[PDB]
Write a protein that binds this ligand. Structure first.
Ligand SMILES: *C(=O)[C@@H](NC(=O)/C(=N\OC)c1csc(N)n1)[C@@H]1N=C(C(=O)O)C(=C)CS1
Length: 469
């Protein structure tokens, strides 16, 4: 008898086109883990590199002879529908800059299982796996996990707090840029995400760094490896390289109300005589407070509604209005010189991550992320849809009970009151808004320095203008 890989229903993929090599590689890696433990009681010589080889190789052979049954997470019909979508629509990513590659991973928000993926436009013509092995910076999609998610979560801010987007410079003396802008004064957390302004993200991380929040603790809990957290542009996705698979897993976390389940493609390995060599252990972990996570899903639902940096919701509506009705949330990213684009989507029941780019690191059109990648993802989204009607779901994302609402002046994210404006102390009034907070006591009173970030010059022109009462 010979070894085999099966779809999650039970259908045999192949015996022992990305489909084959992904499930086989993850298969071998769990095999390696088990061999290294299966006695050969190792640790640390596991670090020596001559061994690694020996085992990796030994691993491969155990699958070739050995005769085991490998159970994947893959839902055949969706996976096929996905391959078809890329065959039928990959071409909408092409934008006068040569074949554009693509990597997507569709992940259950609750198991962490991967129901299917897109490896690239065409395994025959080119084999790198853009869903699994390639790594690029996630850009402005880092913002929600590494800056805002965290700070809200340490109650250092809430839903309508306020960030300086006034001009300001890295420590080298160069201007923090957004596309072509030097900045624009103050704005809500809402605006800053809907447009992905860079400066607000820059001030957020900086403040985290001054309270020394254990940022790394958080990122590490989702599976991220970032070699150096002391980079000023970190939050914008500077110094971070990731895979679609892995980062899809980051959006899975915000989506499953702050609870990370570890990504995977393999659920079970079973030996000839039925003995279980590997089985997926469900260990959940609570990376963000349900307060924080649900707050975030609210804001990330306007990121798509707003349509400011993605045409998606329009594209999807046009190809299928019912579905465009599911409670979608998401975020985009663009890297320097338009070299990559990212779009992450979740409804509460699934996540879809999608990266488009060139293999050799050159540039896409300006539109590629905002338009192309959006319309393509909307077609992929239908395609899964058609293949498995119930899959995406109808549930709403919802603000958790533990969230805490506050009345605050639109003008300063903060509860109204007296403040010190250079002699002449001030009664601070204007219209209010409810602002969500993931701490026990809600918003502060207004303070001269209400916003995250801002210079002295800044606050002066800001409070100046707030003064027309
Ligand atoms: C977010 O990704 C931010 N982009 C950038 O800061 C930089 N690129 O600008 C052309 C960048 C970030 S990391 C890196 N290596 N380069 C804004 N993101 C979007 C978006 O798609 O949401 C934009 C509309 C353009 S800039």
């Amino acid at each position: 008898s010979i070894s085999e890989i099966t779809y999650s229903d039970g259908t045999v993929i192949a015996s022992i086109d990305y489909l084959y090599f992904t499930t086989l590689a993850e298969a071998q890696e769990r095999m390696y883990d088990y061999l290294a433990q299966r006695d050969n009681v190792s640790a640390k010589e596991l670090k020596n590199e001559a061994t690694q080889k020996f085992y990796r190789d030994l691993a491969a052979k155990e699958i070739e002879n050995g005769g085991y049954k490998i159970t994947t997470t893959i839902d055949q019909k969706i996976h096929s529908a996905m391959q078809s979508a890329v065959a039928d629509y990959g071409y909408l990513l092409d934008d006068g800059t040569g074949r554009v590659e693509v990597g997507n991973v569709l992940m259950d928000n609750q198991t962490g299982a991967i129901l299917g993926f897109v490896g690239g436009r065409n395994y025959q013509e080119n084999q790198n796996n853009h869903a699994f092995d390639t790594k690029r910076s996630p850009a402005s999609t880092t913002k929600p996990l590494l800056a805002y998610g965290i700070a809200i979560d340490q109650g250092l801010m809430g839903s309508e707090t306020i960030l300086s987007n006034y001009p300001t410079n890295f420590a080298n003396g160069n201007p923090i840029m957004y596309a072509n802008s030097k900045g624009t004064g103050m704005m809500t957390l809402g605006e800053a995400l809907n447009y992905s302004w860079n400066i607000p993200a820059y001030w957020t991380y900086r403040m985290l760094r001054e309270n020394g929040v254990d940022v790394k603790g958080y990122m590490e809990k989702m599976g991220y490896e970032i070699p150096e957290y002391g980079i000023e542009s970190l939050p914008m996705g500077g110094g971070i390289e990731v895979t679609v698979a892995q980062h899809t897993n980051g959006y899975q976390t915000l989506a499953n109300n702050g609870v990370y389940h570890q990504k995977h493609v393999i659920s079970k390995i079973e030996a000839a005589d039925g003995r279980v060599v590997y089985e997926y252990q469900d260990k959940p972990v609570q990376v963000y407070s349900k307060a924080t996570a649900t707050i975030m899903q609210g804001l990330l639902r306007e990121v798509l509604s707003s349509r400011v940096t993605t045409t998606f919701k329009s594209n999807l509506t046009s190809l299928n209005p019912t579905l465009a009705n599911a409670d979608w949330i998401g975020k985009t990213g663009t890297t320097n010189q338009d070299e990559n684009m990212w779009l992450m989507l979740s409804t509460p029941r699934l996540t879809l991550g999608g990266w488009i780019g060139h293999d050799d690191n050159h540039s896409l059109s300006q539109q590629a992320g905002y338009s192309n990648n959006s319309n393509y993802m909307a077609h992929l989204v239908n395609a899964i849809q058609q293949a498995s009607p119930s899959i995406w779901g109808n549930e709403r994302f919802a603000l958790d009970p533990s969230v805490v609402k506050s009345e605050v002046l639109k003008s300063t994210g903060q509860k109204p009151g007296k403040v010190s404006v250079e002699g002449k102390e001030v009664e601070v009034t204007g219209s209010t808004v409810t602002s969500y907070w993931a701490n026990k006591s809600g918003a502060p009173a207004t303070s001269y320095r209400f916003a995250i970030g801002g210079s002295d010059a800044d606050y002066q022109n800001a409070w100046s203008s707030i003064v027309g009462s």
